[PDB]
Amino acid sequence: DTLCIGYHANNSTDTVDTVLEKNVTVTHSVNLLEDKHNGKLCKLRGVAPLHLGKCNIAGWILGNPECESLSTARSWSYIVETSNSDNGTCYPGDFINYEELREQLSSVSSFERFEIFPKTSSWPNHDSDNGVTAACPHAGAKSFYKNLIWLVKKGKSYPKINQTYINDKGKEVLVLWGIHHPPTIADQQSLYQNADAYVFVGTSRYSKKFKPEIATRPKVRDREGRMNYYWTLVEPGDKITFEATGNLVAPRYAFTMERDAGSGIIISDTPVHDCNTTCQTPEGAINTSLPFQNVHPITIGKCPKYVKSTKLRLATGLRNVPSAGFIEGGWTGMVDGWYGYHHQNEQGSGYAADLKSTQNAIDKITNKVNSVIEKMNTQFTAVGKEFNHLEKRIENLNKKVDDGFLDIWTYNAELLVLLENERTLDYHDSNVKNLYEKVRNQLKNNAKEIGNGCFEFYHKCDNTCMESVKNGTYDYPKYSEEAKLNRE
Amino acid sequence: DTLCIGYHANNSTDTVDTVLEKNVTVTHSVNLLEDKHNGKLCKLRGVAPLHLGKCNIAGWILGNPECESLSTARSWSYIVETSNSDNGTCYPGDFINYEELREQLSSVSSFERFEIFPKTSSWPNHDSDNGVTAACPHAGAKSFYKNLIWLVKKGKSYPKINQTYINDKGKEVLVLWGIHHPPTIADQQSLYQNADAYVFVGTSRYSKKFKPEIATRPKVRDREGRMNYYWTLVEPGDKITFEATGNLVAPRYAFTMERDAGSGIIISDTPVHDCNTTCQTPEGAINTSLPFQNVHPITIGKCPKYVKSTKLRLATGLRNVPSAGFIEGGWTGMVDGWYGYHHQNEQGSGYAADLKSTQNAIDKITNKVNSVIEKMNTQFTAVGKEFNHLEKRIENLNKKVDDGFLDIWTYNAELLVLLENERTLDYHDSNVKNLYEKVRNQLKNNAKEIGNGCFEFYHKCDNTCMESVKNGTYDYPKYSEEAKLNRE
Amino acid sequence: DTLCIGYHANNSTDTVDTVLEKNVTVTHSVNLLEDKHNGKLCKLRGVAPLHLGKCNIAGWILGNPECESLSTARSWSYIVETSNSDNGTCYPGDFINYEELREQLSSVSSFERFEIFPKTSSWPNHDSDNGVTAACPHAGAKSFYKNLIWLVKKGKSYPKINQTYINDKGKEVLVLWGIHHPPTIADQQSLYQNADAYVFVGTSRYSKKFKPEIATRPKVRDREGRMNYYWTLVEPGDKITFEATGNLVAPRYAFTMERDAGSGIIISDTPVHDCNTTCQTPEGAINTSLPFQNVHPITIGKCPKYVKSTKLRLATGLRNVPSAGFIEGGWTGMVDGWYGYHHQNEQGSGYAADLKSTQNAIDKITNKVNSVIEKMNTQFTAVGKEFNHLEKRIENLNKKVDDGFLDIWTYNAELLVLLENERTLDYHDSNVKNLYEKVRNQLKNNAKEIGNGCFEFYHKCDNTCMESVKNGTYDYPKYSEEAKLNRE
Ligand SMILES: *[C@@H]1O[C@H](CO)[C@@H](O[C@@H]2O[C@H](CO)[C@@H](O[C@@H]3O[C@H](CO)[C@@H](O)[C@H](O)[C@@H]3O)[C@H](O)[C@H]2NC(C)=O)[C@H](O)[C@H]1NC(C)=O
Ligand SMILES: *[C@@H]1O[C@H](CO)[C@@H](O[C@@H]2O[C@H](CO)[C@@H](O[C@@H]3O[C@H](CO)[C@@H](O)[C@H](O)[C@@H]3O)[C@H](O)[C@H]2NC(C)=O)[C@H](O)[C@H]1NC(C)=O
Ligand SMILES: *[C@@H]1O[C@H](CO)[C@@H](O[C@@H]2O[C@H](CO)[C@@H](O[C@@H]3O[C@H](CO)[C@@H](O)[C@H](O)[C@@H]3O)[C@H](O)[C@H]2NC(C)=O)[C@H](O)[C@H]1NC(C)=O
Ligand SMILES: *[C@@H]1O[C@H](CO)[C@@H](O[C@@H]2O[C@H](CO)[C@@H](O)[C@H](O)[C@H]2NC(C)=O)[C@H](O)[C@H]1NC(C)=O
Ligand SMILES: *[C@@H]1O[C@H](CO)[C@@H](O[C@@H]2O[C@H](CO)[C@@H](O)[C@H](O)[C@H]2NC(C)=O)[C@H](O)[C@H]1NC(C)=O
Ligand SMILES: *[C@@H]1O[C@H](CO)[C@@H](O[C@@H]2O[C@H](CO)[C@@H](O)[C@H](O)[C@H]2NC(C)=O)[C@H](O)[C@H]1NC(C)=O
Ligand SMILES: *[C@@H]1O[C@H](CO)[C@@H](O)[C@H](O)[C@H]1NC(C)=O
Ligand SMILES: *[C@@H]1O[C@H](CO)[C@@H](O)[C@H](O)[C@H]1NC(C)=O
Ligand SMILES: *[C@@H]1O[C@H](CO)[C@@H](O)[C@H](O)[C@H]1NC(C)=O
Ligand SMILES: *[C@@H]1O[C@H](CO)[C@@H](O)[C@H](O)[C@H]1NC(C)=O
Ligand SMILES: *[C@@H]1O[C@H](CO)[C@@H](O)[C@H](O)[C@H]1NC(C)=O
Ligand SMILES: *[C@@H]1O[C@H](CO)[C@@H](O)[C@H](O)[C@H]1NC(C)=O
Ligand SMILES: *[C@@H]1O[C@H](CO)[C@@H](O)[C@H](O)[C@H]1NC(C)=O
Ligand SMILES: *[C@@H]1O[C@H](CO)[C@@H](O)[C@H](O)[C@H]1NC(C)=O
Ligand SMILES: *[C@@H]1O[C@H](CO)[C@@H](O)[C@H](O)[C@H]1NC(C)=O
Ligand SMILES: *[C@@H]1O[C@H](CO)[C@@H](O)[C@H](O)[C@H]1NC(C)=O
Ligand SMILES: *[C@@H]1O[C@H](CO)[C@@H](O)[C@H](O)[C@H]1NC(C)=O
Ligand SMILES: *[C@@H]1O[C@H](CO)[C@@H](O)[C@H](O)[C@H]1NC(C)=O
């Protein structure tokens, strides 16, 4: 009877592109590109994110009346703003180096708001009750920022501030303040009793001077004067000193801080849920061990690299043809293996996988698709970055970097899978052919090969025929004597 | 007679490098690297470029007397300056954020100069005729910028400007102005009657203050005082307000604008011609569907990627050896095909390509070289960028990005073509070998193979021999009986 | 007797990874990754480095008292600061654009300190002896910077400086100056006799104004006023002008300069030695012709590209198995070659390499591993770059570029060597097989092949057997008559 050699063919319609041939089907494949994400904003790197809801960083750090919460976590791995974040610097004016504060805050390994200049009698001879405005209203009354105190004359005088703090808390200490630019001299003289108003701030690493710019301006939130917000980072043991003979919005809470390398902001409405995470996108978290993703180019954490492609499928299985031997096609009559034998005997009709060869193959195939993933060298990054009104050369430079790595990675990846699919899908045919040859190493003359990729054995035998194949032991010349007439 | 198998060899001397063997010749090749360009500056993306001729952007936007033209197009896809562009800010002084204006202007989807502060009586009690000087001369008379008005006292007083505009035109509105720094107090008091001179500008997104710096300076164009040029975008519905109690060079034309993503400047003398374009270089336009180019690293549009290489040629044809079968060499006696048969019969001497195999091959070869081009993912960019006197850390950072992508792309590309040439130039030999084997699938025993890669058939036959090969139908055992004595 | 075919196997345990099989041994290999460096800071590009020892650039250019040397070379290819560099701007205050000056200085093709405003009577009516301070002491006395002169009133007046220089030396001329900010009005009035103190500086390409910021500050080096340091390049034929009615620290030495493209700073303690160099790292110099290095990511010169990998070894030799023919294993009984023949004759026992085939192989293998190196396109760069307190968006952008090229290069390199090891280690088996087939082209029927990968020859012969193989001339049918009975 015959002995036939070929491969498991399977009901699925999984398809892989190969550089030689588009749109071909393979019996099993490993998808490397994540098209699906978990739809949530999630706990990352052991800690929850800071979620700011209706209010942005320029309102949270100022403590806008319309935003009130504990720090989402005394340690957090990113900042999230909702897609609506209209609340902010509700009293208008530019937050200076605001895109830099937004970087340093993005991750902190501790944070504690602490009242370094406490509202209780740190400010004798001055107001700290009635510095309030309609621009940031609550209860329909005048109200104000909670983290900063807007000082005003008491009575008919403004004693110059001389406040000092010495950083004894053994930490980086973030400090902030504001400066007020009244719209008119009449407003300046009424609140601050001084046209010569100025501020000075002193530090070791830093020192700067500020002055008012009294001039009428277009209405925003119907406010006509405007407020400049500034910030500073005093190192351990350093000292910070304020002086003012006028305009100030002095700190009342400073903030204790420490910072790791960090990772930036995300802006979206997705809700927050407990599950742990390593990789993040604006749309939703990902849990993965794959090299490439296409769901969004912005990322936090151990990013998989973004690509514009859609079907990065590596083959693992064979060319799927159910359409005799491999030259006609495979067998769906075979299961739980790859390459194998159909054989006949007195009981016969056996379809069985060759486990030693299949196991040898899948050892190397597992290492192959694994080498594509294990050698990726992913490392902690935050891909989206923030640039203001007049940084457009650098903003476009960023964009050139971002699309350069995109263009490289799609061309690398799409040619990569094409070359390794071209390899593997002939790797199978070469392993099958080599297994056929390995049967020729017994059946050198004593069987009729047929162009289907199969044998006719020249004389009758029991299952001891397949015993001779599986253990390669064949004792050829006796069996030619039974074959004799059928060869003749 | 013999049947011989091999391949078309050709009179051309086209060469391809392969990682195993340098400088080898192949019968046909696809050049992927453009060494040639069309030598023109051209219509791009459906719109003509702005060509500024003898005058640079800092003179065009100011409207230098020595530059006069309509906007080259009411919509343009890039700005061109000629390699000589000496005219510009002919009254000296720094154009502030000038490299940012040069970016935002680089492309516009509409632009219209419109006289938002018209020269007719917008300036009562003030001069607007005699603000002219020799530094930007015409007819040998004093002259001045056309788009800006240099105001001066009328009589013996300078009433404070209070000009306002409200953006009702439903567009981004670009506005510009100048500020004058007289060289001495005597010049300041004579023109502006005020030592306390200052300017304020107010907006929602912006506000700033400016003051004179009265001090003598080294002569340039023999002007000793100097002029600072500033600019602003007012958003739809926003308001802009000027105040001045002195030095101003107030706007008279503002400009309506809208901007797409855009693409930057080119600087060269090449003339302008009508034909449409997608890809640009400083030397000359390109029309292409190739992935790599080496003519210039600066680019606009859907750039092909730059490389330092010179001979990115993919093979498509075979190893060209005219120097019997393929082991001796190919046949120049064969045409309009690749792999093929020489056969003999009573009429005989046939050299003919095997069209089904050749067509099967060229199907896959076309898809191969096409996959290298189609998967490139080119996208709209402008590679050259501009950095001033004191931005050199960023200028070098740009240069590190530019040469990084260069170093990657040449090493990728040159190894890429080497690997795929190494593949294809054995791909041919394996296809030819497999075609020989496919003849062995008839001629298993009934022909003498010879070490040239050819057959002697053991008995005489008509063209029905080639009929048996072309249709694989051979009826072997009868034909052994005529072969009998010649095998014996 | 027998003719046996296989390959040299060798005592070494050099190992290569292949995508199909980890940790396999190969007889010989070319390491592409420099694990080792020469431990020195070295002469580069034909010129010495500048080595600044105990003092940093912000003290050298000022000429701190504790820093005294010639320029280490009148031309230098990089600046080196020792890992201790605590001396610097020993009178405190920000060196303005200091990270930019640190770039332009990094390499100079000439530099000469020259006393453009010589201490001899360029400063009538003013002090230049007693402008000294305890903040930069020597001998326990007051002392001061050497390259700058701190002017002070003489008597009870301060005549306005009006110094001028015209760049007649035909070079770029670097100029520097300081500005002093006394801590109190009392200190200002006592030293400079004027409250209105200001400085102006004039140039063609540049002009600016400066003023004092008199306010108390936290002690550093127990100094309470602070000093701002500024700089300028005047172009050939250009003029520079100083004016002051007060605070100045005027130049006394300017510096003649010219600059190439340049390459940045290194900071380390490694000692300086004479040997010439092209490639550099902070730890120690390198001399190399390899593409990849992992010893440090910061570099100068013609950098090899950094990777995080550890064992980029290309194969050159074969699969090493000493464990009959190649199917059992190789021979350590063979030397000075690769593929070869064992043969027998009346004297016999010959093990000899096939020199024409081995030479043919090593021609192509040498070109292979060479093509991986020769095409690298290395070009002169300086990878580490410097960003200050408030440039963290750009500092992180740099970091995204740096780890992008890292991530690309490890993934490219590790998959690159895996693919070419997978290629070569079957390239050998295919060349050996083809050499076996090339013996079949004589021994078509006239020898018994055995599954070890070897021949038994059917009749007795002298060394003329190996003569027939080496020269492919075999006269088959005349010899068959001795083989007759042994084939029967
Ligand atoms: C998500 O992540 C959290 C951490 O943020 C996981 O908490 C895990 O909790 C177990 C105990 O339930 C921790 O193990 C125990 O920790 C204590 C000290 O806390 C130690 O004394 C015990 O011997 C034991 O190790 C575990 O360490 C902690 N995980 C980590 C990463 O620290 C939580 O289980 C995670 N949840 C999910 C659904 O993955
Ligand atoms: C170069 O590009 C221009 C466009 O900038 C090409 O103009 C083409 O002109 C033809 C008419 O000759 C347009 O076809 C007709 O357009 C009208 C609207 O204008 C429409 O109603 C008709 O149905 C028809 O489409 C054609 O659309 C237009 N091209 C484009 C892209 O809009 C010009 O022909 C090009 N020249 C060369 C030499 O390539
Ligand atoms: C390290 O590099 C230095 C250069 O910085 C090498 O100096 C070499 O010295 C030899 C002396 O025989 C020079 O040869 C002669 O130079 C003169 C001009 O100086 C010329 O007129 C002669 O015809 C001859 O070329 C040699 O040119 C010079 N090298 C270079 C690159 O100019 C020094 O030898 C190097 N040392 C080591 C250990 O590599
Ligand atoms: C942020 O607070 C501001 C006021 O501080 C809110 O602004 C007002 O919003 C209402 C609608 O809710 C508008 O009709 C008013 O015109 C807004 N005020 C002004 C002065 O223009 C705003 O709603 C808050 N944002 C969010 C997201 O709750
Ligand atoms: C730009 O205009 C300036 C004057 O506004 C021209 O400068 C003069 O050029 C001539 C040579 O053509 C010189 O001899 C004069 O000395 C220049 N004048 C000054 C005041 O420096 C200049 O030629 C114009 N540029 C172009 C390209 O036409
Ligand atoms: C740089 O010079 C400064 C003084 O100008 C030196 O600083 C002193 O260092 C000693 C220790 O060596 C300290 O005890 C003193 O308190 C420091 N003086 C001041 C004023 O702070 C410094 O040592 C020099 N640096 C080097 C590397 O030699
Ligand atoms: C077809 O394949 C699916 C998916 O593996 C499997 O669940 C199913 O049992 C198969 N059915 C048949 C009829 O082969
Ligand atoms: C690939 O197969 C799908 C499903 O049958 C078919 O729709 C598509 O047209 C095929 N692709 C091409 C390139 O024809
Ligand atoms: C300000 O505070 C310091 C604290 O040391 C004190 O010595 C000084 O007298 C105060 N007043 C002024 C005007 O500096
Ligand atoms: C026969 O084959 C099986 C599976 O390979 C093996 O375990 C067994 O030892 C072999 N027996 C002999 C006698 O070779
Ligand atoms: C040689 O090749 C060229 C270009 O393909 C062709 O035009 C020409 O006719 C050929 N000539 C001969 C003599 O083969
Ligand atoms: C390739 O051949 C051409 C023509 O003879 C010659 O110019 C060139 O130098 C050769 N290149 C190599 C690498 O031998
Ligand atoms: C300036 O213009 C505004 C326009 O609303 C006007 O109300 C105001 O009175 C003008 N004058 C001054 C001095 O502001
Ligand atoms: C012989 O070959 C041609 C071309 O392959 C084919 O059209 C024809 O049908 C074949 N003959 C028969 C009898 O099928
Ligand atoms: C083993 O290899 C080393 C290094 O190639 C060589 O020096 C030595 O002589 C070899 N020894 C033996 C015994 O093969
Ligand atoms: C490689 O071989 C070494 C011994 O030389 C062994 O310790 C190591 O485990 C092997 N590698 C792997 C991946 O098993
Ligand atoms: C300053 O120097 C210039 C040029 O030497 C000279 O003309 C001028 O009179 C000097 N004095 C003043 C006050 O400008
Ligand atoms: C035999 O082989 C050697 C080495 O290849 C060669 O030099 C010699 O010419 C050959 N013999 C003949 C008769 O050609």
Side-chain angles (χ1 to χ4, degrees), chain B residues 264-281:
Chain B
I265 300 176
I266 284 173
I267 301 191
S268 69
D269 286 353
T270 299
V272 186
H273 290 87
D274 179 61
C275 196
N276 293 323
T277 311
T278 55
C279 319
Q280 182 65 48
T281 79

mmCIF file of all heavy atoms in Angstrom, chain B residues 264-281:
data_model
loop_
_atom_site.group_PDB
_atom_site.id
_atom_site.type_symbol
_atom_site.label_atom_id
_atom_site.label_comp_id
_atom_site.label_asym_id
_atom_site.label_seq_id
_atom_site.Cartn_x
_atom_site.Cartn_y
_atom_site.Cartn_z
ATOM 1 N N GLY B 264 7.822 74.752 4.111
ATOM 2 C CA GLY B 264 8.679 75.913 4.268
ATOM 3 C C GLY B 264 9.209 76.576 3.010
ATOM 4 O O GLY B 264 8.638 76.469 1.922
ATOM 5 N N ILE B 265 10.350 77.257 3.177
ATOM 6 C CA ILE B 265 11.041 78.067 2.178
ATOM 7 C C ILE B 265 12.022 77.244 1.340
ATOM 8 O O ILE B 265 12.526 76.201 1.778
ATOM 9 C CB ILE B 265 11.764 79.194 2.939
ATOM 10 C CG1 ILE B 265 10.748 80.031 3.701
ATOM 11 C CG2 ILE B 265 12.566 80.047 2.012
ATOM 12 C CD1 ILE B 265 11.352 81.097 4.554
ATOM 13 N N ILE B 266 12.270 77.699 0.102
ATOM 14 C CA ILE B 266 13.389 77.270 -0.738
ATOM 15 C C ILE B 266 14.118 78.521 -1.215
ATOM 16 O O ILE B 266 13.492 79.552 -1.468
ATOM 17 C CB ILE B 266 12.924 76.423 -1.935
ATOM 18 C CG1 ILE B 266 12.572 75.027 -1.464
ATOM 19 C CG2 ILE B 266 14.010 76.326 -2.971
ATOM 20 C CD1 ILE B 266 11.960 74.184 -2.530
ATOM 21 N N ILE B 267 15.439 78.441 -1.352
ATOM 22 C CA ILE B 267 16.249 79.576 -1.810
ATOM 23 C C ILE B 267 17.125 79.168 -2.997
ATOM 24 O O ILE B 267 18.132 78.474 -2.815
ATOM 25 C CB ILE B 267 17.098 80.155 -0.670
ATOM 26 C CG1 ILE B 267 16.170 80.622 0.454
ATOM 27 C CG2 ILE B 267 17.982 81.281 -1.168
ATOM 28 C CD1 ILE B 267 16.830 81.440 1.533
ATOM 29 N N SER B 268 16.762 79.612 -4.206
ATOM 30 C CA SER B 268 17.550 79.310 -5.401
ATOM 31 C C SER B 268 17.103 80.178 -6.575
ATOM 32 O O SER B 268 16.040 80.804 -6.534
ATOM 33 C CB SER B 268 17.433 77.835 -5.777
ATOM 34 O OG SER B 268 16.128 77.553 -6.245
ATOM 35 N N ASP B 269 17.950 80.218 -7.619
ATOM 36 C CA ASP B 269 17.755 81.023 -8.829
ATOM 37 C C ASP B 269 16.985 80.326 -9.948
ATOM 38 O O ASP B 269 16.716 80.961 -10.971
ATOM 39 C CB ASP B 269 19.107 81.458 -9.412
ATOM 40 C CG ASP B 269 19.776 82.545 -8.610
ATOM 41 O OD1 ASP B 269 19.151 83.063 -7.675
ATOM 42 O OD2 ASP B 269 20.928 82.901 -8.929
ATOM 43 N N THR B 270 16.641 79.055 -9.801
ATOM 44 C CA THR B 270 15.967 78.336 -10.875
ATOM 45 C C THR B 270 14.685 79.056 -11.303
ATOM 46 O O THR B 270 13.944 79.560 -10.451
ATOM 47 C CB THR B 270 15.656 76.908 -10.430
ATOM 48 O OG1 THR B 270 16.882 76.232 -10.139
ATOM 49 C CG2 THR B 270 14.929 76.134 -11.516
ATOM 50 N N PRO B 271 14.405 79.149 -12.602
ATOM 51 C CA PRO B 271 13.220 79.878 -13.067
ATOM 52 C C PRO B 271 11.933 79.095 -12.838
ATOM 53 O O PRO B 271 11.939 77.881 -12.636
ATOM 54 C CB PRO B 271 13.490 80.066 -14.561
ATOM 55 C CG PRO B 271 14.298 78.880 -14.923
ATOM 56 C CD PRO B 271 15.195 78.648 -13.738
ATOM 57 N N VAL B 272 10.812 79.811 -12.912
ATOM 58 C CA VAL B 272 9.496 79.258 -12.598
ATOM 59 C C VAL B 272 8.773 78.871 -13.880
ATOM 60 O O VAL B 272 8.725 79.652 -14.836
ATOM 61 C CB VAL B 272 8.656 80.266 -11.796
ATOM 62 C CG1 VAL B 272 7.349 79.634 -11.351
ATOM 63 C CG2 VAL B 272 9.443 80.790 -10.609
ATOM 64 N N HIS B 273 8.210 77.661 -13.899
ATOM 65 C CA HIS B 273 7.503 77.138 -15.061
ATOM 66 C C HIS B 273 6.235 76.416 -14.622
ATOM 67 O O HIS B 273 6.100 75.977 -13.479
ATOM 68 C CB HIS B 273 8.402 76.221 -15.893
ATOM 69 C CG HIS B 273 9.499 76.951 -16.602
ATOM 70 N ND1 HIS B 273 10.722 77.207 -16.021
ATOM 71 C CD2 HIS B 273 9.554 77.490 -17.842
ATOM 72 C CE1 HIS B 273 11.485 77.866 -16.875
ATOM 73 N NE2 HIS B 273 10.798 78.052 -17.988
ATOM 74 N N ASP B 274 5.308 76.292 -15.573
ATOM 75 C CA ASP B 274 3.917 75.973 -15.262
ATOM 76 C C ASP B 274 3.678 74.549 -14.771
ATOM 77 O O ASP B 274 2.711 74.320 -14.038
ATOM 78 C CB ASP B 274 3.045 76.205 -16.490
ATOM 79 C CG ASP B 274 1.598 75.863 -16.234
ATOM 80 O OD1 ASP B 274 0.986 76.490 -15.347
ATOM 81 O OD2 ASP B 274 1.079 74.944 -16.896
ATOM 82 N N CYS B 275 4.504 73.582 -15.144
ATOM 83 C CA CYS B 275 4.062 72.199 -15.020
ATOM 84 C C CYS B 275 3.854 71.791 -13.567
ATOM 85 O O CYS B 275 4.519 72.282 -12.652
ATOM 86 C CB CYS B 275 5.063 71.254 -15.670
ATOM 87 S SG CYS B 275 4.391 69.602 -15.957
ATOM 88 N N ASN B 276 2.884 70.898 -13.365
ATOM 89 C CA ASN B 276 2.480 70.477 -12.035
ATOM 90 C C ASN B 276 3.508 69.535 -11.408
ATOM 91 O O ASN B 276 4.276 68.859 -12.096
ATOM 92 C CB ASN B 276 1.113 69.799 -12.087
ATOM 93 C CG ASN B 276 0.000 70.760 -12.459
ATOM 94 O OD1 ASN B 276 0.018 71.921 -12.058
ATOM 95 N ND2 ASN B 276 -0.982 70.275 -13.220
ATOM 96 N N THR B 277 3.481 69.474 -10.077
ATOM 97 C CA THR B 277 4.541 68.866 -9.282
ATOM 98 C C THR B 277 3.943 68.283 -8.013
ATOM 99 O O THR B 277 2.881 68.709 -7.553
ATOM 100 C CB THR B 277 5.624 69.877 -8.916
ATOM 101 O OG1 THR B 277 6.021 70.585 -10.089
ATOM 102 C CG2 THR B 277 6.817 69.182 -8.318
ATOM 103 N N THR B 278 4.636 67.295 -7.452
ATOM 104 C CA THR B 278 4.360 66.800 -6.109
ATOM 105 C C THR B 278 5.553 66.861 -5.164
ATOM 106 O O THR B 278 5.351 66.962 -3.954
ATOM 107 C CB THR B 278 3.842 65.359 -6.179
ATOM 108 O OG1 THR B 278 4.779 64.545 -6.892
ATOM 109 C CG2 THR B 278 2.505 65.324 -6.880
ATOM 110 N N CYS B 279 6.780 66.834 -5.678
ATOM 111 C CA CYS B 279 7.991 66.709 -4.880
ATOM 112 C C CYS B 279 8.953 67.781 -5.353
ATOM 113 O O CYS B 279 9.064 68.022 -6.554
ATOM 114 C CB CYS B 279 8.640 65.339 -5.048
ATOM 115 S SG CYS B 279 7.487 63.951 -5.082
ATOM 116 N N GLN B 280 9.637 68.438 -4.432
ATOM 117 C CA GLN B 280 10.425 69.603 -4.787
ATOM 118 C C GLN B 280 11.807 69.493 -4.161
ATOM 119 O O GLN B 280 12.004 68.761 -3.193
ATOM 120 C CB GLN B 280 9.717 70.863 -4.288
ATOM 121 C CG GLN B 280 10.373 72.170 -4.604
ATOM 122 C CD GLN B 280 10.391 72.431 -6.079
ATOM 123 O OE1 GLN B 280 9.378 72.282 -6.749
ATOM 124 N NE2 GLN B 280 11.526 72.864 -6.591
ATOM 125 N N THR B 281 12.786 70.154 -4.763
ATOM 126 C CA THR B 281 14.104 70.321 -4.171
ATOM 127 C C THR B 281 14.593 71.718 -4.519
ATOM 128 O O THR B 281 14.081 72.342 -5.453
ATOM 129 C CB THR B 281 15.120 69.276 -4.649
ATOM 130 O OG1 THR B 281 15.605 69.641 -5.937
ATOM 131 C CG2 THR B 281 14.493 67.900 -4.726
#
